[PDB]
Amino acid sequence: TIQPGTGYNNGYFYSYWNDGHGGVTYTNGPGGQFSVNWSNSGNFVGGKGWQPGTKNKVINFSGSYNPNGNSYLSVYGWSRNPLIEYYIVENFGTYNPSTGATKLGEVTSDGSVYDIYRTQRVNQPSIIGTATFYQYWSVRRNHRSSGSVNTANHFNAWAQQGLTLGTMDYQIVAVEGYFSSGSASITVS
């Protein structure tokens, strides 16, 4: 298991963050593989990918994803200037992260329609410190734990709708939890 932070493992960038509550272990495996095991966690996000990401990467993911409670499985990353936290959500647990959010469009990609949303975080942790920032979401209608994500289809649809991204920071396939339990084993490429 590893220490919250960022770095490289077997050629892949990783990021593992948590709120300090406990109840979650993150492990880096061979190649693009990582695993998460959590029991009565707080808020955490971990996974493997790239630093920096790109606006036209085709990302593959494969494995198992077994949340018990509030959790997401997504292509996840940030842009700077403007600061944006973004998600291409392929699966989730008890909570659709777009609940109560205003729908800003649809995009069809990689075998499913996705619904597009913008939300806002206020005085929340980020890659540059505590801040207020927008989040962009593509939420897949057909849930899955393996597949291919053509990120350009999402970024282009977001930009079309006025959801523009700045300079890309990291870009990973992430398991996120918010006060839940679960297990996951995911291989990225």
Ligand X SMILES: O[C@@H]1[C@@H](O)[C@H](O[C@@H]2CO[C@@H](O[C@@H]3CO[C@@H](O)[C@H](O)[C@H]3O)[C@H](O)[C@H]2O)OC[C@H]1O
Active site residue: 85, 110, 115, 169, which one? 85
Residue 121: Cβ-neighbour burial (10 angstroms; 0-12, 13-18, 19+):
middle
Q: Which is nearer to ligand X, 114 or 170 (CB)?
A: 170
Mapping DSSP onto H, E and C, the string for 95-113 reads CCCCCCCEEEEEEEECCEE
Q: Is 183 in the site for ligand X (CB under 6 A)?
A: no
Alpha-carbon distance of 145 to 18, in angstroms, equals 22
Q: Is 127 in the site for ligand X (CB under 6 A)?
A: yes
Q: Is 40 in the site for ligand X (CB under 6 A)?
A: no
Q: What is the chain's percent helix, strand, coil content, to nearest 5? A: 5, 60, 30
Contact residue for ligand X among 74, 85, 115, 117 (CB under 6 A): 85
Structure tokens at 9: 């493992």
Active site residue 90: no
Active site residue 85: yes
Contact residue for ligand X among 13, 15, 109, 163 (CB under 6 A): 15
Q: Is 187 in the site for ligand X (CB under 6 A)?
A: no
Active-site positions read: 85, 176
